[PDB]
Every structure is written in C-alpha cells, then in structure tokens.
Symmetry: D2
C-alpha cells in the first residue's frame, strides 16, 4: 500500500525502535527526510540582509520570522526594514506555491528599574507598525511581562510576548514568567555571561522541557552558526548545536550576526533549514508522544481533547497532514504541543494569526482571503478544500493520502470539537 | 470533585507501576461504570419460565445459550420463544429496552473427524429460528469452521461463529482457527479433560491474550460459579475465577448448570454481574491501553483510525461514554478493542447487530426503532439524542458529562470517519 | 534475539523452549500472555510452599510421609477444633514422619509446624483459650503462629506477649479476616512477620465480590514489604469429595501464585477429605506451572523501582545476586543463613533461580518455607577450626546437595551469597561459581 | 543537601520530560569528572611546564598527530609528556597516569601506507598505549594496523577513526574487530553532508555503548578557543551533548596543539563534562543498557552487572576493582554506574589505557608485596580506599562495592563485596 521505500525514509526504522538506545543505533545517514521542515527560522535583519532582493532570497531559503533588534538603529531605520520585509513577502502573492506569511518580531533594547523610556517608545512603534511578536529583553519576573503588556497600549493586545531569559533571576523565576508570557527565548549570549558558560546547556534543556510541557513556544538563540559570519561553512559544534536544539524540543531557532551583519546570511538560513529537517526526522516520537500524554493533565476543553485525538489518529495512519481551521491560531497550537509527525496545516482568515503561528513547531499557515459563503457549513468545506489543494500544490498531499481534519461545531473562536479522517480525492 | 477521584479504583488507576496499582486497590472504592463484560446464561429447566427469564434479564443476562447436547428441537424452540417473549415484554419503553442474543451451542463431532449429521440439523434449526451466535463445539482446525459456515447456508451469513477450543489440537492450531472465526470460547470443561488440569489456566490466558490482540471476542466458560447450583453463595475460588477471567481480558463470562438446572439461576447472574463490575474497575488501563496501541498495526481504514482517536480523546477527558452509530456493529467492535474505560453506547437499527455486539466488552447496544428522517444529518442527530436520552435514563450519563460521538460521512456501513466532543446538556 | 543468541547456541533451542522462556522474553505483558505455551514444560523446583491442615484424614505417620513426598512444607494445626492432647499427637506424628527421611542429610526435607489460633470470638482482644494455646505452642516448639482475626497492631503485640521470652523466635503471621483488618493493614503488616489472606471469614465480613480486591492488595503490599503472604481457604474445596478439582479451583491456585503469594493453603482438603495426598499433588502441579508463567521482566523492574535505596549490606548483596542470577540463567543462588533473613531478602526480588539456604538452625530451616523460592538445607556437621574453611564446606555441601537433588548440573553457574564474619546480620558477599 | 546536589531531583524523575524540567543550574556536580579528555600535543602544549598545567587541568590522554612532524619531533613530545607525568609520582596516592595515543596520517590516495607502517613501528618502539587509526573503511584495515604493530605491540589499543561514508556503512564489521571508535567529525563533515554528521555521531555512540567499547567524540568541539579565551554557546552545548549522547572521551585538536589557550580549553572541557555527567538520565540509561546487554555465562560479565546494580541500590560512592588488563573495569563501565570505578592495577599500561572507558579512575599500585595472596588483595583494596579518601571520592560512612577474583591472573573476576568505609 505504501511500499518498503516509504518505511526506509524519514528515519522510520529508528522511529519503530522499542528503546531510545535502539533508536540511536538505527539512525541512518542514508534515510532521507521527506516531511517539510517544522522548526521555524528567525533571522535578524541588518545591513547584510536589509535589501528587498536579499530578503527574497532569505524567504526562499526558509526564513519565517524577521527579527528587528532595537538595541541598534533608529525608528526610521527599522521602519524601512519592516517595509522591505513586507515588500519581499508580498512579491510572492502571485504564485501560491511560493507565497508564505513572514512574522515581524521586535526585540527590545532592555532595562534600571521598570520598563526603560526607550522600550516604552519602541513598543509603541511596534504597535503603530503592526508587529506580530515582541522579544522582551532581560525578563526577570512576572511584573516585567506585565509592564511590556501595558506598554503594548490599547491597540496591541494581540501581539505575542516572548520573554527573553538572560540571567540567573530569570532562570530562577522561570515558572512565574512563563505563566504570563506567550513563550520564551533562551537568550544564550547574555545568559552565558550572567551564569557560568558550562551551565547554559542545563538552563536551555530545562526551559525547553518546561515550555514543551506548558505547550508554549520556545526559541533557542545566539551563536548557533557564529563562524558563518565570516566562513561559508559552519563548524562541527555549530551543526550539532542546531540539531540538538531541535532534538531538545525548540519550536524556533534563531540567527543573529549570521544574518544581520555576516558575509553569508542566505547560506546560514539554508544551513539551519537543512539541519532542522534532518533533526526533526531523528526525534523519537514513540517516547515523546507517550511522555507528553502522561505529563499533560486531563482536560475538559474540547479543543485540547480534539487535538490529542487528532494527533493519535494521525500517528495511526501516517497521515500526511492535519488540516485545522483556526481564527486565533489556538487550535493549531494545541495540535503542535503533542508533536505530531504530520504537518499541521492551519487555515485562517487572520493575517496576524497566520504570521504568529510560525512560533509553533510544525504549523504551516495558509491565509484564506475568499469572501464568506452564505451557508457556514459550505464556508467551512471551502476552507478545508483550500488546505487540501494548497497541500497538493506544495507537496504535502497526493490523491489517495489520508488527512485528519480539525474543525468546530459553530462559527467563532473557541469551539473546535471535531476530528475527521478524510481520503484525498 | 474529590469524591469522583476516590470511586472506580481511580487512585489505583493513576499508579505508575502494576505493583503500586495492586497496592492501591480499595474495597471501599465503589464501581461507577456500567458492567462491561457480558453474561451468557444457559437456558434449562431452572430458567425457561417467562417470568424467571424477565428476572434474569433485569439481573444482567445478555446472551441466552441453548445447549444442543441436551433436549430435542421442540424443547429448544420453546426455550427460544420464552426468551423472546421475556425480552419483548420490555420493548414498550425503547429508552430502557435491553436486546438479548440467542446462542446455539452444538453437540459436537463425537468420535467423527468433522461436522456430524446432528450438528448439520441443529445448525439448520438455528438458521430457521434466527439465532444470533453459534458456539461450535470441538473446533480443531480452520476447515471445521468452514464446515460450520457451509452448514449455516446463505441465510445464516450474518450469524457469528464462536469456535470452542476444547483439546490439544485446537490449542496448537489456535491461530488458524481464530483467523476464520468471529471469536473464541475457552471451553474449560473438555479442555481440562483433554490436557492436564494444571495447564488450563495457561491455555485460557494465552487465548484471551491473542483474542484481545486480534480484536475478536473471547468467552471464558465452565464451572465459574459451580457451587451455586446447590448453594446460595459461591466459594472463594469461584468469585476469584470470575474476577480473574475479567482481569485476563475476557469479553464474556458464562454460566452453565448455575442457570440451566440449579436452584439459584437469578442469584448466579447477579453474582457474575457484581464481580465483573468490581474487576473492570481494577483493570490497569494505563498499561493495557499502551500495550494495545503498541501492538496494533498502522491502519489506513478510517473506522479503525477514528476508533483509536476517539478512545484517546475519551481517556483525555474522562468521557462517560463513546456514542457510536453502527449498522453491522463493526464501528463499536473497533472502539471496544482498545478497551476504553468509557462505555461504548452503540445505536443501531439492526436488531441482530444489537444482539451480537454483546460479544464485545463494553458495548451497550441500543435498538433505534424510528423510520429514517428525510434529512440524513437530522436522522444522525436523532440517533445520537436517543443514545444520550437512553444513557441518562440508565445512569450512564449526567448533565455536564463529556461524551465522544462517532459517526460517518454518508449512509451505509463502512464509512465511519468522524469523532466529536460533546457536552451533555 | 541478539540478547539471547550466544546463550541459545550454548544452551540449545530446547532449553529456551521450556519453563515459558519465550513468554519470559516478551517485551509487553500482552505479548507475554500470547506466548504462554501448554507444551512448554516446567523445569524449576516448585517455589510456592504448600501448607496442609492436619486432621483425621492426614494424621497417621504413613499418610504424613506420603504428604511430605507429595510436597507439603508446612503442617497447620487448627486450634479451633481438638484438644491439646489431640494436637500434641499430631505434632509427634508430623515429627516422626519428617525424621524418617533424616538418614540422608543431602535429601532431608524440613517441615514447619504452624499453630492456627481459635480467635477472639465476641471479645475485643486476646482470649483466654488463645493464651493457653499459644503457651502450648511455645512448649511444643511450633515454628509459626497464624493469629486469627487480627484487627490492629495491638492484637499482634498481645500475641507476641503471650508467646513470652521463650517464643521470641516464633513467626507471627496475622490473619486478615474482616473490614477493620483490611483498613488497618499497614499498621498490622509493620509489626507482623507476614500475612494470611483468610478468605473464608473475609468473604462473610465483606461482600464476596470484593475479596479478590483485598487479596490482590494484600499480596501486592506484602511483596512490596518483602514479607510472606499466604493465600488460604477453598482453593481446591471440591477435592474434599472428588479426585479432580473444578476449573475455577485450578484457576484460583494459579492466580494466587501469579498474584505473588509465598504460600498456598489446604484446609478441609487435607484435614478431612477423601483425597489429601492428591490435593497436595494438585497444588504442587499448578504452582510449578504458574511460577514459570510469572512475567519476571516486569516484576523484577517493578520490585526494583518500588524498593527504596538501602544501606543494609544484606539487602544490597541480595539485589546484586538476583541481578547476576538473571544475567546468566543461574540454576541456583546458594546462601548461608542463621535466621533465614539473607534468604528472605533474596526471595523478595523473586528470582527465577532457586534460593538454596544452608543453615545450622533447624527452626530457621523450617521457617524459610514461608518465603517463596527458598529451599532449606539443614547442615549437621560440627564447625571447622578455621571459620573460612567451615563457610567453604557449607557452600560445597549446598553444591553437592544441589547436584544430587537435580537442582544443579555440571556446566551450570551458581551465585553464592555469604558474610564477612560469623553471626547473623553480616551478609555482604556475592560470588559467581561454575559447577564442575 | 545531598539530594539537592548532582542533579539528584532530575535523577528521580519518572519521565525524560520531567527529568529535563528538573535540571537545575544551582545543583552543583559532586562526582569526579568521568569523560576523559584527549589533548593534542603541538607547539602550544609541548613544554614540560605547560604539560604539568594541562595534567592538573584534566588531560588524561596526550594525542600525537602523525600527519605533521618528524619521528624526532614526536619522540621529544613523548619524553616531555612522560617527564611532566612522572613529576607527580612522588605521591602514589594522588599520581595520575596519562595515556599516549598515536594518531596515524592515513592511507591518502591508496590500504595501509608505508608511512603508517613506519609510524606504527615507532609507536611500538616508544611504548604508546593507543593508536587512533585514520580513515578505517573496513575490518581488513584494522587487521592491517594490528599486523603492523607486530607481536611486541599486542597490548596497544586500536581505536578506529570513522571519517567517511564507507566507514559509517561498514561500522558493525569495524567495531567488531576494533578496541573502540573515534567519530572523526572533521573529515566526516567533508565526506558526507555537514547536516548529517550528528546522525552518524549519535548512531556510532549508541552502537559503541551497546557493544561496551570506548567511543571518542572529536574535532571542533571548542574551535573558537584557538584564538579566544571563551568558547561560543554552540561549542559548550556541543561538548555537553557529546557527553549526554554517551561519549567515553572528548577531544581537543587545534585548541591544544596550536591555540593561544590550551590549558583553558582543557579546563572548559572538564567543567562542561562534569555538569553534563550529572545531567545523564541514569534511570532510563541503566534500564536500556541492562535490557540490551546479552545473557552471559562469563563470570566477569555476571559480576559486573551485579556490582553496578548493588552500587545503584546503596548510592555507593565507588566500585573498587582489581584489574590486570583493565577488562574487569571496562565491563563495569559499560553499565554506566553513577559510582566511580576505581581500578587498582600493577600494570602501568593498563592504568593508562582505562582512561578510554568512561568513569574508570586508574590507580597504579606500587606498594610492597604481601606473602599471602589473600593479604595482597586486601592491601590493594585498602590502597583503593585510601587514595579514594585522599582524592575526595570517599568519606567515612560511605558504602563501596569491591570487585575481586578467586585466584591470581587475569580473567578470574567473580566476586562482589559490600564494604563500609572506616
Ligand atoms: O523521546 S525523545 O526524543 N527522548 C530522547 C532523549 C533522551 C532520552 C533518554 C536519555 S538517557 O540519558 O536515558 C539515555 C542516553 C543515551 C542512551 O543510549 C540511552 O539508552 C539513554 C537521553 C536522551 C524526547 C525528547 C524530549 C522530551 O521532552 C521527551 O519527553 C522525549
Ligand atoms: O509482571 S507481573 O508478573 N505480571 C503483570 C500482571 C499484569 C500486568 C498488567 C495488567 S493490565 O491490566 O495492564 C493488562 C491486562 C491484560 C493485557 O493483555 C495487558 O496487555 C495488560 C494485568 C496484569 C507482576 C505481578 C505482580 C506484581 O506485583 C508485579 O509488579 C508484576
Ligand atoms: O483556533 P481557534 O481560534 O479557536 O478557532 C477555531 C474555530 O474555527 C472554526 O473551525 C471555524 O470558525 P469560523 O467559521 O468563524 O472561522 C470554529 O468552528 C472553531 O471554533
Ligand atoms: O459500524 P458500521 O456497520 O460500519 O456502520 C457505521 C455507519 O453508520 C453511520 O454512522 C450511519 O449510517 P446509516 O444512516 O446508514 O445508519 C454511517 O455513516 C456509518 O458508515
Ligand atoms: O541471614 P542471617 O541470619 O543474617 O545470617 C547470615 C550470616 O551467615 C554467615 O554467612 C555465616 O555465619 P556463621 O558462621 O555464624 O554460620 C555470616 O557471615 C552471615 O552474617
Ligand atoms: O580485569 P582482569 O584483567 O581480568 O584482572 C582481574 C584479576 O585481578 C585479580 O583480582 C587479582 O589478580 P593478581 O593478584 O594477579 O593481580 C584476579 O583475581 C582477577 O582475575
Ligand atoms: O539578546 C540576545 O539574543 C542574547 O542575549 O542572547
Ligand atoms: O462445552 C463446554 O462449554 C466445555 O467443554 O466446557
Ligand atoms: O480462618 C481462616 O483460615 C479463614 O477464615 O479463611
Ligand atoms: O582526523 C580527525 O580527527 C578528523 O578528521 O576529524
Ligand atoms: K535587543
Ligand atoms: K454443547
Ligand atoms: K482458627
Ligand atoms: K592524523
Ligand atoms: Mg541579550
Ligand atoms: Mg465441551
Ligand atoms: Mg477464619
Ligand atoms: Mg581526519
């Protein structure tokens, strides 16, 4: 039905292993990855990656989130970077095979007591320019997040706040920070200066583990491919670091100087893309799924209940994708937390949700712009078919495949409760 | 509430090891779930009175067994008529009506090598009288099952054949017999004479294990409550034997002389009911579900994929029930094979399928009698509402419970593909 | 298959087909059940002890010799019936039958004598008849007391006090027979040497459909504590009048062994029935089949995970010896013991290997029958001048007795467990020896 | 306080996910660093005074890269290493043996090259302990290296370097005839796509752990430390992940051979390895190693499993083992005990070679002999205890597992004893 060739690809012999030791022993360099790369790539915009033509090459290479580092540059400089990103993104609104939403994230300069005056002004700039995410620098406690949230004013409550953990206090107060944040960034640069360099891997693994347990995005950042600022190829430690961040459970991986100022910004994005694809196939889903299941408390929320049912069904049939309809991205995030091998294709009418779901591993957003049908059930079927046809066009799906489809019982956010098994025709 | 988590051996259910699970079993933890292992009662002089049969149905009898080793065809036709008269006396309340299957147990081949002439005549009697199940005596190989199937003719294509394993050859050729049978009966009486008495428990445990792995019904039979033929209370070994047959994984438990000729037929049914309810709560679902999922192969059949998704969703939310619409009983059987703690309420229009699904542990059949609605989606919803209303009346459901609803995308058998999370209102 | 390939080439495919070894290698309990085979013959010596109640059907010396040969390890005297004179005669007949085999020290079978008390009756604590019967037990040298209707820790303290300073070595097995005993189980087990799941009264005191829960819970907790647990009452009841038991009875015996019972008991089946010897033979045959069907892979992992870390060298040596025995498919673990404690600590990890306990104490040799898998050998030789040579002689006695008894063959590996100095409490050494 | 140190809350976790969640930057490592450090000797690390600092920093194996330098150059490096090592021999209870490994140039465009034959002969003549054989592609390459060592070099350990696709594909046949493996990531990263090297590393480490044979992770682990005093975030993560993967040894090449911070690079590897060893999830690792190790009738194999099990049961500070060839210590090491394996040996070569096995701390026995063999054994065990107390491995009141044999000579280990310290 699928063939022996299917079961030799994407580390499937290592996937069937009964122990983690046997899983390692069965990893094969000749077993090619087939699934689309699920860990998002955040690229820092700077002199080496500002031009519209360079940004088009970075989008093609795999960049999903453009980071603006507000530690340098004026508001005028960053507004031009935003306009260049949006111009490069919209240049592909013709071909549906190449069009992809790209999120814009603002990284603050940092704190002094309370939020700095420059951070208040930069956060206001972000709201005025429609940024999707804020990477808040030096978050140490829950009140630091509340201050950033308050500065996002009356108009920016939909912006995701990713708290950067950069010091001992942030690590110690991690649980209270994660509870009030949308996600976390393991900011290894400052963290490696604030705590002993030999302890950073413990903080990284702990934070990734806790974010995976909470179902919240976690970004691994800084010096992942550092030598690529001046060299065309990374060191053996650098490729290992990227692979291990993905195996640890990071939703996003980041490039800073590699894309902002280095000589090989596009090559650095290509390298992160190539490593993440290899590492995602090497994940030991048998143990991961069982442990995510065992740790996750019982839930009476139908979205959470449908999500675990859909992920279980996708593993049972080797589903090419899980197509989910989402207004805020939440139904896609709840599927993503169980780490399915199947791609989560999120169909949405919200351009902001489409950009923000790049924070969740394995979510491939599709922005639906067709006008509503008069009959709601027909409008749902048209969006389900839109995900199927986009999936066929991009290579996720073929006729005869099985897909899991996740929808809700009435319009509006918060009513997901249906999982369907569909044969692609 | 805290009271909820003290009942149905929930502290023992949360245990991390089987040893800790045994340590946490509590005699004060009352069973809450409806009894899921079916009771087969043999009909005889002690249980043919229509008024006595009504008491046995109320006590929990699900399948009435006619032992063709004793009595004439005229005697068995009167047994069938009395069973049907007692069963149909409750049809005036469709929300509480309990279907009861009729099983024909053959005399056997005797000194012959294959199907005897008396068995050919008895099987034809069964088809003419509309029996639901055949317990075929002394099945030794796959060709014995084919001969029973041939003797049932074209009119008896829907009858379930449960092969009785009663000797060494049947145990050795078990795999080939199970492959062509609808299920198995561990016929301990003859088996204990054909093989050493001290080895029967090994054959019982092996056969139950293999049937659970195949997703096919398995019946534990003979001398389970033997002393209740003359005494009002069973021995300590007898109550333990019933509990252990349920813990082993038997779908059905049987009564022979206890109901056919003894002085306490109703009390024997009540005792099996009481023990099975206690033993089902003591099942270690944490290990059982993991092992059934791991052993079950990948499937591209949407009914099988929806079944595992629905069972996973039911465990996630502590669903009171899985309501499934079924024509042949197949969708209910595929849910049952994963051993959910949630009751599988099977709503069907087929009176025969309603009787036959008693062979699957945890399937509670409801016979829907209303003619089809003009709009198919309304007819589906009416059947689901009938399941909810029957469930509320019988104590399976309460307002505020979560229920998993399993349906298909079009009319007719074979199209189950939808799982939905529903709150009981 | 790579984890057993070399040992399969060495020991042969026939070795790995016996004693439910394909079911033993299974990765899940479901696959373990699927691989159980009625043609896979048991090889190991029966490890669950059989307690037989002595009565009119089993009191003669000649009948007792047949019961010892059939497998009886513990003789139970039910003090609910019979006078002190009647029970003293039963004790003398048991000792005469047991000593008739003492001529060959290498094959002699010690048999424990257990006194089962009448109980408190309508009273709240220790009755006057129990005080008199317990003093009779001390005066007649009984090894074990099965204390009836234990409801709390003070009930066992009262039994201990009635035994006096002379009965300090007697094992107290508390009988759990009612709701209060089940609810106060933890405090009772803490002060008892073991437990008896007394299903007869328990099945009257609590709903009959709940007894299996109390049995499984108590066996689980005793296995966790490493203390003996006895499953009792109506196991082979129909064998009082019939030569073959019912299908529920053979299942009940097998399930008590699979649950983890150290001992199984016969009451009326041996005390008053028409087939006392056949009932013992049936329990022996079922226990051997059920012991091979135990899923050691999960059981050993769970016993290890649940057992707290220990700084007691006897406990540390015990787990190391059991681990080593599983690694090499050791035929036996030979242990030197004074009180039986080192053998009990090996037994709590449920090795597949027989635990051959070499002791000079006749009482400890009788009492270790309470621990599953312990085969006592009574050493009658006087001590050597050099302690190290005396220890080596005792180990060689175990090997030679094991060879003559069929436990050990040339080429087998055995694990030997000893201590660093004389006296109880100093076990700390494990050795791997090849049988030549 | 005991249960807050060495990641013990994370060690008690019921799942790997919970284990990650409980990792604590404030939980200080207490156990001695188990993963050996191999430092390449070059212009930056050739002086006797420099080598003494590197030994104090944690260097266990000195690597001589025969791709560069003459035989005269390498003989001087060997003499300087031995002079620095022997400067600490005055205190036998604290003396640290250091192995000398010869890394061959390789076959180049060719089987065994003529320069490799000459270099291997040099190694035997100069008493090297280990050979890192370059570009091993099949079992016959190992046989050729073994033949070139001759009858005088029967005791030298051959660690096969896997550097290309053929070596990865023929891994099982190479490991079967080798003493261990080196994941030579430099050439491997050029021979196969750079994004696939982590898969080859994890597979090879897993298979060596399964076989109970040493595995070395090598190349660019702390590359930026050649010119900078601190490594990058990717470099510290790489070292930690090689240890978490299961590497017995970690290596420094240019960082020690030609870089500006050779001592600091050794100190950095030491600090990271200690932190990573405490973060190992022993609960799962021991169960998996135990399950996968085949049944055995070899008493040394049987005693080793029993001793490791007993060490975990009592939180033993150490397993003290008497060994002639190092084999009894290697069989204990394969089960990855948390307890240090203190190997007491009279063989100076075995003391150097057991650095290839994670968690084996060699002690070279040089005390006068005892006339009674039982007394001589007891004295070697007391020597293990005293050196352990002096070095901080043991304290009074600790439990240790002692692994001895029933008669003199190698191959007779069969005894495990539980001993209370002082
Ligand atoms: O299922 S996974 O992809 N886990 C694999 C990672 C892993 C498990 C266990 C160990 S171990 O130290 O026990 C060990 C190390 C090396 C061995 O050879 C060995 O046998 C055992 C190390 C590493 C996963 C990832 C992230 C999670 O949050 C999660 O819940 C599960
Ligand atoms: O390892 S053992 O020898 N026997 C395991 C007995 C057992 C385990 C699990 C279940 S289960 O309900 O999960 C289940 C039932 C039926 C299936 O087919 C299935 O896959 C799973 C039932 C029974 C053992 C005995 C006593 C102990 O105290 C102990 O720690 C371990
Ligand atoms: O993931 P979210 O934000 O809750 O959105 C899920 C919602 O999407 C839907 O599937 C479709 O709703 P709309 O037609 O309003 O887009 C709802 O039925 C469901 O509640
Ligand atoms: O379990 P079965 O026999 O396959 O029946 C399931 C069928 O029942 C339904 O849910 C309802 O079908 P009907 O309207 O024909 O009764 C179908 O959609 C589905 O295919
Ligand atoms: O199991 P116990 O009661 O602790 O006895 C074990 C004891 O037996 C021995 O092996 C032998 O002791 P004895 O010489 O006193 O008989 C002791 O070394 C050890 O302490
Ligand atoms: O690990 P190896 O090489 O097998 O050496 C272990 C040997 O060491 C000993 O413990 C002591 O032997 P020596 O007295 O020869 O040093 C032997 O009993 C044992 O066989
Ligand atoms: O700010 C950052 O990204 C850091 O410190 O690593
Ligand atoms: O026929 C039967 O039911 C039997 O033999 O047990
Ligand atoms: O006393 C007993 O043995 C009982 O009640 O079972
Ligand atoms: O030779 C080496 O060490 C390499 O290639 O990495
Ligand atoms: K910044
Ligand atoms: K019949
Ligand atoms: K009594
Ligand atoms: K070289
Ligand atoms: Mg920073
Ligand atoms: Mg029969
Ligand atoms: Mg009683
Ligand atoms: Mg190289």
């Amino acid at each position: 039905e699928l063939g022996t060739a299917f079961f030799q690809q994407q580390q499937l012999p290592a996937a069937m292993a009964d122990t983690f030791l046997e899983h390692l022993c069965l990893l094969d360099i000749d077993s090619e990855p087939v699934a689309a790369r699920s860990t998002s790539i955040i690229a820092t915009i700077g002199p080496a990656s500002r031009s519209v033509e360079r940004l088009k090459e970075m989008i093609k290479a795999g960049m999903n989130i453009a980071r603006l580092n507000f530690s340098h540059g004026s508001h005028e400089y960053h507004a031009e970077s935003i306009a260049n990103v949006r111009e490069a993104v919209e240049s592909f609104a013709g071909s549906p095979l190449s069009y992809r939403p790209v999120a814009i994230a603002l990284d603050t300069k940092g704190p002094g007591p309370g939020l700095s005056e420059q951070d208040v002004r930069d956060l206001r700039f972000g709201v005025e320019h429609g940024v999707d995410i804020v990477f808040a620098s030096f978050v140490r406690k829950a009140s630091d997040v509340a201050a950033v949230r308050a500065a996002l004013g009356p108009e920016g409550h939909g912006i995701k706040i990713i708290s950067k953990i950069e010091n001992h206090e942030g690590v110690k107060r991690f649980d209270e920070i994660l509870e009030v944040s949308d996600g976390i960034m393991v900011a290894r640069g400052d963290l490696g200066i604030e705590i002993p360099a030999e302890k950073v891997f413990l903080a990284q693994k702990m934070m990734i583990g806790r974010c995976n347990l909470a179902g919240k995005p976690v970004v691994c950042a800084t010096q992942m491919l550092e030598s690529m600022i001046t060299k065309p190829r990374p060191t053996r430690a650098e490729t290992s670091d990227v692979a291990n961040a993905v195996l640890d459970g990071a939703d996003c991986i980041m490039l800073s100087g590699e894309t902002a100022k280095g000589n090989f910004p596009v090559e650095a994005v290509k390298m992160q893309h190539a490593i993440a694809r290899e590492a995602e196939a090497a994940v030991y889903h048998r143990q991961l799924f069982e442990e995510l299941r065992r740790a996750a408390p019982l839930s009476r929320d139908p979205t959470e209940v449908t999500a675990i049912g859909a992920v279980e069904a996708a593993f049972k049939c080797c589903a090419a994708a899980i197509i989910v309809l989402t207004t805020t991205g939440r139904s896609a995030q709840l599927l993503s937390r169980y780490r399915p091998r199947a791609a989560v294709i999120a169909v949405t009418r919200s351009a902001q949700a489409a950009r923000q779901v790049h924070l969740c591993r394995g979510v491939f957003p599709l922005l639906y712009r067709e006008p509503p049908e008069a009959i709601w059930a027909d409008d749902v079927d048209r969006r389900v078919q839109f995900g199927i046809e986009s999936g066929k066009l991009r290579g996720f799906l073929r006729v005869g495949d099985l897909v899991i489809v996740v929808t809700g019982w009435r319009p509006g956010s918060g009513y997901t409760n249906i999982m369907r098994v569909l044969s692609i025709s």
